[PDB]
């Protein structure tokens, strides 16, 4: 995607949105970092930075209950 | 390929002939967006610029490139250029990418003859 | 190089090669041009001995015994 061999999407062909461009700019629409996860929660869904860090933490643990709430 | 000397020298001739290749080099675009500007030939109207991109490289062309290209063309023109990328593969004019190659081929042939004629 | 005297083409260079033939290795000539690669394979006759590398490096030309393109 860096060298023009495939269409760049933010992040996926279908599932992309231009509001993710400032977040995903540095990585050409590829989700690389823990910090990008947090910026997506801030920008896309209005999270606080601290609530965003709590989402990333919950994604590490992978618990059944826990996601269900943040998913909402 | 090969040699970056020859390709950049060859680019100098392209610039020396094509107003668009010259303009692109003056703007000095970085890479991906440069390749978009490079694979397209620049038609220019009274207040418009429609870059006819080789549909052969349609997958390079993205709005993220177009907007950076537009800012650059606007910096060149010194006033707001409505720069658009359009997708028409017709070969009637040469892009600065397509521009490079022909002269090189011809030069190769001539100098192959000189080498054959060195004698021994 | 671009600079090939005349003599070097046909005399000194040739004479170094002339006494040492063996170990059939096809002889190709690479005329490295600034322009392009023109490939005239000499193969007039000489199939070189191994020791000639060092002796050939002796006069104005650096090269190597590379994987032969011809063989494959």
Swiss-Prot record, chain B:
From the record, give the cysteines joined by S-S bonds.
none
Q: What domain of life is recorded for the organism?
A: Bacteria
Q: Which family does it belong to?
A: Belongs to the DnaX/STICHEL family.
Oligomer status and interactors: The DNA polymerase III holoenzyme complex contains at least 10 different subunits organized into 3 functionally essential subassemblies: the Pol III core, the beta sliding clamp processivity factor and the clamp-loading complex. The Pol III core (subunits alpha, epsilon and theta) contains the polymerase and the 3'-5' exonuclease proofreading activities. The polymerase is tethered to the template via the dimeric beta sliding clamp processivity factor.
- Outline what the protein does: Part of the beta sliding clamp loading complex, which hydrolyzes ATP to load the beta clamp onto primed DNA to form the DNA replication pre-initiation complex. DNA polymerase III is a complex, multichain enzyme responsible for most of the replicative synthesis in bacteria. This DNA polymerase also exhibits 3'-5' exonuclease activity. The gamma complex (gamma(3),delta,delta') is thought to load beta dimers onto DNA by binding ATP which alters the complex's conformation so it can bind beta sliding clamp dimers and open them at one interface.
Protein name per Swiss-Prot or TrEMBL = DNA polymerase III subunit tau
Curated annotation (Swiss-Prot), chain C:
The subunit field of the Swiss-Prot or TrEMBL record says: The DNA polymerase III holoenzyme complex contains at least 10 different subunits organized into 3 functionally essential subassemblies: the Pol III core, the beta sliding clamp processivity factor and the clamp-loading complex. The Pol III core (subunits alpha, epsilon and theta) contains the polymerase and the 3'-5' exonuclease proofreading activities. The polymerase is tethered to the template via the dimeric beta sliding clamp processivity factor.
Q: What does this protein do?
A: DNA polymerase III is a complex, multichain enzyme responsible for most of the replicative synthesis in bacteria. This DNA polymerase also exhibits 3' to 5' exonuclease activity. The alpha chain is the DNA polymerase catalytic subunit. It is tethered to replicating DNA by the beta sliding clamp (dnaN), which confers extremely high processivity to the catalytic subunit, copying a 5.4 kb genome in 11 seconds, a speed of at least 500 nucleotides/second at 30 degrees Celsius.
Q: Which gene encodes it?
A: dnaE
Into which family does the record put it?
Belongs to the DNA polymerase type-C family. DnaE subfamily.
**Organism name:** Escherichia coli (strain K12)
What does UniProt give as the signal peptide span?
none
Q: This protein's superkingdom?
A: Bacteria
Q: Please report the name of this protein according to its UniProt entry.
A: DNA polymerase III subunit alpha
Write the span of the intact protein that is present: 1089 to 1160 of 1160
Cellular location(s) = Cytoplasm
